[PDB]
Amino acid sequence: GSWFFGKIPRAKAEEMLSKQRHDGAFLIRESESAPGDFSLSVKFGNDVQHFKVLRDGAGKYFLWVVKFNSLNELVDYHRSTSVSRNQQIFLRDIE
């Protein structure tokens, strides 16, 4: 299903992802910190991590240092490059 949840509150995103069986279950939402901000929310075991997704001066999105022309490309990238640097966790659709 669609991974984009608009303005879902942070706590509701945590509630939703905490029910998931697979690490890497995720959503993208529109977060509260600044206008236009997105956040990637991801299940890691008993935790849900939030990662701000900001835009650079060219309009590209990023979590750390790789830049993307779209949210879909950011998601695509993390279906096969881990969102953890300690263990292999790829983004996986909510079930």
DSSP readout, the chain? ---B-TT--HHHHHHHHHT-SSTTBEEEEE-SSSTT-EEEEEEETTEEEEEEEEE-TTS-EESSS-EESSHHHHHHHTTTS-S-SSS----B---
Tell me, what CATH number does 25's domain have?
3.30.505.10
Q: Please say whether the beta carbons of 38 and 65 come within 8 A.
A: no
Number of separate domains in the chain: 1
Give resolution, Å, one decimal.
1.1
**Determination approach:** X-ray
Q: Which domain holds residue 7?
A: 1-95
